[PDB]
Amino acid sequence: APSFPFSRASGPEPPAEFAKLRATNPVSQVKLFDGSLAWLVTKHKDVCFVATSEKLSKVRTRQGFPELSASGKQAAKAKPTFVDMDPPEHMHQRSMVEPTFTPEAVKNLQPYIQRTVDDLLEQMKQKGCANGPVDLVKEFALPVPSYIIYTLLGVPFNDLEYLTQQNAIRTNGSSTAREASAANQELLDYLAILVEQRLVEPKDDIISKLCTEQVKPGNIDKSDAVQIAFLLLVAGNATMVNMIALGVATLAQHPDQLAQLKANPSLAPQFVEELCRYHTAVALAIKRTAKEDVMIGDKLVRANEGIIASNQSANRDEEVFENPDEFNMNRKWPPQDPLGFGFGDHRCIAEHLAKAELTTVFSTLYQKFPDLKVAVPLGKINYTPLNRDVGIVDLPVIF
Ligand code: HEM
C-alpha cells in the first residue's frame, strides 16, 4: 500500500497515481502517516456514492477516521462544527448560517461582489507597474475573497487589511509553526470580540444573526458562534485565493482561450466551471469511516475502516469527462456534476458564492487590464509545495 496523500506530478498537475488507479484498481488501500490503512476511491460514480452513503460517517472521534497528518489528529479533539457532523446535527447547525449563501442571496450579492473586485482592480491601476511587476496574489487574489467573507461576517472596513494579512500568515508556507498558530489564535480572539459586540448591538452581518437567532435563545453559546464564524472564514479563503491565481495562470497557458474570454466575458461562467473541475484545489475533504460494512465496486469496506474519496480524480474520470486532462472552457458537459465543491449533504456551503466571486473576477479582470501578463516564464511560476493541494504562492504580473 503506497503512502497517502500523494504528491502532485508537477506544479499545475494532479498526482500521477490517480489515472493508473482509475484504470486498474479504482478502489484500493493506501497507507496513512501513522501506518493505518484507508480506502482510496478514485472513480466519479464511487466518489458520489461515498459522499452520500448514510452508512458512512464524518465524525472524527470514530476509530478508523482517515486523518492525513499529525496536526489533523490533534484538531480532531476539539468540539466539532457542522463540517465534521452527521445528520441530524449537521443540518441543525449548518442551516444556522445557510441564508447568506443560497443561490438567491448570492444573486442579490452580485453588485457588492462586483464593486469589491472593481475597487481592488482600480487600486492596482492607480498604483501601476511602471517600476516592475506587482504580485497579483497580494494585490488582488488575496484581498477579493478575504474582504468579501470578512465583510459578510461583520468585520468593519478599517480592519480588513490587517485581518486579511493575519489570515494569510495562517496558511503561508513561509510561516513558522508558531507564527501560524499566533495568527490563528489571534483571529479567534478578534471574532470573540465581535460576538460580544454584536450580542449587545446587532448589525446586518452573519455574526449578528448567530448572536440574535442562536446565542441569545440559548441554542448555542458564544464560543460556538466564534467557531462557526471561524469555520466560514478559514474553510475556503486560501482556496479562493489559489483558484483566482490558478485561473490567471491557466489562461496564460492557453492563449486562445484567454483570447476567447477577452473577446467575450460572457464565457466567464463556463470558464469557472472548467477551472473548478480541472484544478480541484480541495481534494482531501471527502473522508469517511464506515459505520458498518459497505460494498464499493469489487471491494468490501468493513465497519470502522476509513475512506478517502478523491473528487480530484473523479473530475479527471474519463468515463464521465471526455479528454479529462484537457482544459477546455468550451467543454461539452455531461449530466454528471463535476465535484470541485464536493457532493451530497456536505457539499460546499459557499459553492454559489465561490462561483460568483470567480465569475466576477474572470468577467472583469481582462476588461480592466486587457494586456495583463504574468511577468515571469509560466514554467517558473511559484506553486504551492507538491505534497499540498494545488495553488500558487505569488504571481508577478504587468498590465
Ligand atoms: C473556489 C473555492 C472553494 C472550493 C473549490 C471549495 C470546495 C469545497 C469542498 C470540496 C468541500 C467539501 C464538500 C463535501 O464534503 O462534499 C467544501 C466544504 C465547505 N466549504 Fe467550500 N470551497 C470553496 C470556497 C468556500 C468559501 C468561500 C467558504 C466560506 C464562505 C467555504 C466554506 C466551506 C464549508 C463551511 C464547508 C463544509 C460544509 C459541510 O461540511 O457541510 N468554501 N468546500
> How many beta carbons lie within 10 A of that of residue 19, not counting itself?
18
Contact 282 CB / ligand 1 (< 6 Å): yes
Q: Which residues pair with 57 in a beta bridge?
A: 289
Pairing status of strand 299-301 against strand 287-290? unpaired
Ligand 1 atom nearest residue 345's Cα: 41
**SS3 per-residue string spanning 302-347:** CCCCEEEECHHHHCCCCCCCCCCCCCCCCCCCCCCCCCCCCCCCCC
Q: Which residues pair with 31 in a beta bridge?
A: 3, 37
Ramachandran angles phi, psi of 11, nearest 5°: -30, -65
CATH number of the domain enclosing 291:
1.10.630.10
Show binding-site residues for heme: 348
Ligand 1 atom nearest residue 231's Cα: 35
Ligand 1 atom nearest residue 342's Cα: 16
Asked if 234 contacts 170 with a C-beta cutoff of 8 angstroms, the reply is: yes
Distance 375 CA to ligand 1 centre (A): 31
- Of 145, 136, 75, give the one whose Cα is nearest residue 350: 145
Ligand 1 atom nearest residue 145's Cα: 27
* CA gap 320, 44 in Å, rounded: 7
Ligand 1 pocket test: pick from 311, 348, 360 the residue with the most ligand atoms within 8 Å of its Cβ.
Answer: 348
Asked if 345 contacts 82 with a C-beta cutoff of 8 angstroms, the reply is: no
In the block, cell 489564535 appears at 185
Q: What type of residue sits at position 150? A: Y
- Of 263, 355, 298, give the one whose Cα is nearest residue 27: 298
Q: Which residues pair with 180 in a beta bridge?
A: none
Distance 61 CA to ligand 1 centre (A): 21
* 392's grid cell: 500558487
* CA gap 246, 390 in Å, rounded: 9
Method: X-ray
Asked if 58 contacts 84 with a C-beta cutoff of 8 angstroms, the reply is: yes
Distance 274 CA to ligand 1 centre (A): 17
Distance 187 CA to ligand 1 centre (A): 20
Residue having the nearest C-alpha atom to atom 25 of ligand 1 = 236
Those residues whose C-beta lies under 8 Å from the C-beta of residue 164, and which sit 6 or more positions away, are: 142, 143, 146, 147, 150
* CA gap 268, 107 in Å, rounded: 16
- Of 234, 66, 264, 53, give the one whose Cα is nearest residue 145: 234
Q: Which residues pair with 118 in a beta bridge?
A: none
Collapsing DSSP states into helix, strand and coil, what is residue 180? helix
* CA gap 96, 94 in Å, rounded: 5
Residue having the nearest C-alpha atom to atom 35 of ligand 1 = 232
**SS3 per-residue string spanning the chain:** CCECCCCCCECCECCCHHHHHHHHCCEEEEECCCCCEEEEECCHHHHHHHHHCCCEECCCCCCCCCCCCHHHHHHCCCCCCHHHCCCCHHHHHHCCCCHHHCHHHHHHHHHHHHHHHHHHHHHHHHHCCCCCCEEHHHHHHCHHHHHHHHHHHCCCHHHHHHHHHHHHHHHCCCCCHHHHHHHHHHHHHHHHHHHHHHHHCCCCCHHHHHHHHHHCCCCCCHHHHHHHHHHHHHCCHHHHHHHHHHHHHHHHHCHHHHHHHHHCHHHHHHHHHHHHHHCCCCCCCCEEEECCCEEECCEEECCCCEEEECHHHHCCCCCCCCCCCCCCCCCCCCCCCCCCCCCCCCCCCCHHHHHHHHHHHHCCHHHHCCCCEECCCHHHCEECCCCCCCCEEECEEEC
| Residue 343 Cα to chain centre, angstroms | 14
* CA gap 134, 123 in Å, rounded: 12
* CA gap 208, 325 in Å, rounded: 44
Ligand 1 atom nearest residue 85's Cα: 40
Q: Cα 170–32–303 angle (5° rounding)?
A: 115
Domain limits for position 373 = 1-399
Q: What type of residue sits at position 340? A: G
* CA gap 399, 130 in Å, rounded: 10
Q: Which residues pair with 300 in a beta bridge?
A: 295
Distance 185 CA to ligand 1 centre (A): 22
* CA gap 394, 384 in Å, rounded: 9
* CA gap 282, 276 in Å, rounded: 10
* CA gap 116, 121 in Å, rounded: 9
* CA gap 374, 135 in Å, rounded: 10
Those residues whose C-beta lies under 8 Å from the C-beta of residue 169, and which sit 6 or more positions away, are: 175, 179, 180, 183
Q: What is the number of structural domains in the chain? A: 1
Asked if 20 contacts 310 with a C-beta cutoff of 8 angstroms, the reply is: no
* CA gap 59, 322 in Å, rounded: 35
Q: Which residues pair with 41 in a beta bridge?
A: 27, 309
Collapsing DSSP states into helix, strand and coil, what is residue 199? helix
- Of 376, 367, 393, give the one whose Cα is nearest residue 125: 367
DSSP assignments along 72-128, one per residue: HHHHTTSPP-GGG--TTHHHHHHTTT-GGGSHHHHHHHHHHHHHHHHHHHHHHHHH-
Distances (CA, A) of 104 to 108, 271, 345, 355: 6, 22, 19, 13
Contact 239 CB / ligand 1 (< 6 Å): yes
Per DSSP, the chain holds a count of helices (H) and strands (E) of 17, 12
